[PDB]
Design a protein around this nucleic acid. Structure first.
Length: 159
RNA sequence: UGGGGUUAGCGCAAGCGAAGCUCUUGAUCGAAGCCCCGGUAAACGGCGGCCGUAACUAUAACGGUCCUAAGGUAGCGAAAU
């Protein structure tokens, strides 16, 4: 939650169009659907009045004020079956339903997040030292080099 | 209102031109209707895309977007591609 006021004035080139679009150009960081849900939440004021109809036609000469909240990967505790661990290489047996790289929808609970929790400063190496990808539905051995010179030798070996 | 035709007359003429009549452009009056606003879907109708995730767990529901008003609720799935 990041409660920051957002007030802006609509120009004269948004004539005859709806509410979701008008806030979109003036606020590039937030798109139509993100704007749409907050409109339905009765937390956006137009001309000092709250609106309930996103399909309204607004042209100009209006002061819209959004008074609401706004908002790398947080590590999570995941059980990992360590096979071999030392100062240069890390051999891990990846269990079932565990993806090696988080995406849009899995901020925490992956191999990279678990490795962050397992060793905090592991974020120094790119991609937390993973060299090859593997499907989450498939279990098997995964190799991670602890030190960054080992990263260069490993990627060159696969080439 | 404007213009044209005709002519009592004014002009030794070219022409102009009173009144009346006529033809034509058409200012003001001019509502409905058309749009416009809010409802009306047991009215006619519509409930789709583009990127990426698992879920194929007991029930099939979760994110990020288009220029759309809106993306399928339960029910039942091998269905109409």
């Amino acid at each position: 939650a990041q409660r920051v006021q957002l007030t802006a004035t609509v120009s004269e080139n948004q004539l005859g169009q709806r509410l979701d679009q008008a806030l979109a150009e003036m606020f590039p960081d937030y798109s139509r659907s993100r704007i749409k849900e907050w409109i339905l939440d009765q937390r956006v004021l137009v001309n000092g009045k709250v609106c309930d109809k996103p399909k309204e036609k607004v042209l100009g000469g209006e002061q819209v004020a959004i008074n609401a909240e706004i908002e790398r990967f947080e590590p999570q505790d995941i059980p990992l079956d360590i096979v071999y661990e030392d100062e240069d290489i890390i051999i891990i047996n990846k269990p079932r339903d565990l993806v090696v790289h988080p995406g849009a929808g899995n901020p925490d609970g992956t191999v990279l997040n678990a490795l962050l929790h397992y060793y905090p400063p592991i974020a120094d190496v790119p991609r937390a030292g993973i060299v090859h990808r593997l499907d989450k539905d498939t279990t098997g051995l995964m190799v991670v080099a602890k030190t960054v010179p080992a990263q260069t030798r490993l990627v060159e070996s696969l080439q």
